[PDB]
Amino acid sequence: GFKQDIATLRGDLRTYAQDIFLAFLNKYPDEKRNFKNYVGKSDQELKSMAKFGDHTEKVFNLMMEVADRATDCVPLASDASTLVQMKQHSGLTTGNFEKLFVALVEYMRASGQSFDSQSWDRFGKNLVSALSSAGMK
Ligand code: HEM
Ligand SMILES: Cc1ccc(C(C)C)c(O)c1
Q: What is the rounded CA–CA span in Å between residue 88 and residue 94?
């Protein structure tokens, strides 16, 4: 389930983070605009860019935290508060997040692995709910 899937991703977090976030940029090619540094670059090029690797790690380090802290795939409001409030998410909207989570769940469903994709889908949904309620557009 959800809790074991957090353990699984935390076991190879570097590589799960880059692959899922890459799955997101390729499914929604328009999302690369938030990351102009990432335009006209192949996945293998992106994974050799210092900020690509480090920022994607920091994203998933935090993602997993919020996941870890959730009850029944419902994140804390305080963690909703943090994401919305972050300076680096000034120009973001909940649709950005939904897409990250469509890809992630798609990624898990196409994996060979027994990820609890149902959980992550709720979790994605419930984070978007909670970003709305904390004031994300
Ligand atoms: C659960 C979801 C997410 C978490 C936990 C998260 C976390 C973070 C963190 C920790 C940073 C700062 C890292 C750093 O500057 O070193 C950051 C920056 C940023 N995030 Fe997010 N983020 C999330 C979702 C998103 C989504 C969906 C987008 C865009 C669609 C996005 C776009 C950005 C951008 C553009 C920055 C600043 C530029 C950059 O980091 O290279 N984030 N986020
Ligand atoms: C927050 C965040 C997420 C992902 C990336 C790419 C490396 C994929 C960033 O630069 C920043």
A: 14
| Residue to mutate (ligand 1; options 88, 126, 128, 129; most atoms within 8 A of CB) | 88
The technique is X-ray
Which atom in ligand 2 lies closest to the alpha carbon of residue 58?
Answer: 1
Is 97 labeled as ligand-binding? yes
91-99 contacts: CB < 8 A, separation 24 or more?
A: 91/34, 92/34, 92/136, 93/136, 93/137, 94/128, 94/131, 94/132, 94/136, 94/137, 96/31, 96/34, 97/124, 97/127, 97/128, 97/131, 97/136, 98/124, 98/128, 99/24, 99/27, 99/28, 99/31
Measured in angstroms, the resolution is 2.0
- Torsion of Cα atoms, 3 then 54 then 29 then 97, to 10°: 40
**41 known ligand binder:** no
Phi, psi of 41 (to 5 degrees): -130, 135
